[PDB]
Amino acid sequence: TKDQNGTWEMESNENFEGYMKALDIDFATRKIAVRLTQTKIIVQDGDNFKTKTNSTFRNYDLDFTVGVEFDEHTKGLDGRNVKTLVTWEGNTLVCVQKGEKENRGWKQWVEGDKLYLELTCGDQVCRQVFKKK
Numbered sequence: 723t724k725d726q727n728g729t730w731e732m733e734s735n736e737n738f739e740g741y742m743k744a745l746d747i748d749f750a751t752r753k754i755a756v757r758l759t760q761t762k763i764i765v766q767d768g769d770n771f772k773t774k775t776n777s778t779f780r781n782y783d784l785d786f787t788v789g790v791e792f793d794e795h796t797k798g799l800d801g802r803n804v805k806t807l808v809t810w811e812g813n814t815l816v817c818v819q820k821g822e823k824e825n826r827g828w829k830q831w832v833e834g835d836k837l838y839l840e841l842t843c844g845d846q847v848c849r850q851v852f853k854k855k
């Protein structure tokens with residue numbers, strides 16, 4: 723369990739193109755997406771999270787309560803319907819997205835004033851680091 727509240731500015735993004743490719747996102751959207759800075763805003767009131775991942779092209783907003791399974795519609799990404807559950811494994815927030823894609827989900831944790839995010843889909847891992855502003 724840990725405080726992840728804040729505005730976080732991207733400082734690193736490794737193999738985002740491989741992750742988008744495992745999601746079958748098209749060539750044109752990917753080439754534009756891989757070059758953009760992302761900012762993440764997170765408001766955390768206990769077990770309720772409101773998140774926004776912004777970039778000039780397109781944004782992605784995801785709200786959820788820890789430990790309550792829900793239906794996520796990945797609109798603006800691959801636009802699939804997945805069954806999502808986010809839980810705490812120590813101070814990593816762990817998300818599994820059950821559906822057609824194998825091994826799909828993410829892990830998010832803080833160290834110092836950096837937010838680390840690991841995104842998985844199939845055999846592809848994408849590593850991102852953001853710094854709190």
Ligand SMILES: CC1=C(/C=C/C(C)=C/C=C/C(C)=C/C=O)C(C)(C)CCC1
Nearest residue numbers: 755773775777780781782798799828830
């Ligand atoms: C593919 C893609 C995007 C990235 C989406 C990601 C991967 C969202 C992650 C959300 C999570 C993990 C939030 C938890 O803190 C953008 C930048 C919207 C632009 C359009 C294409």
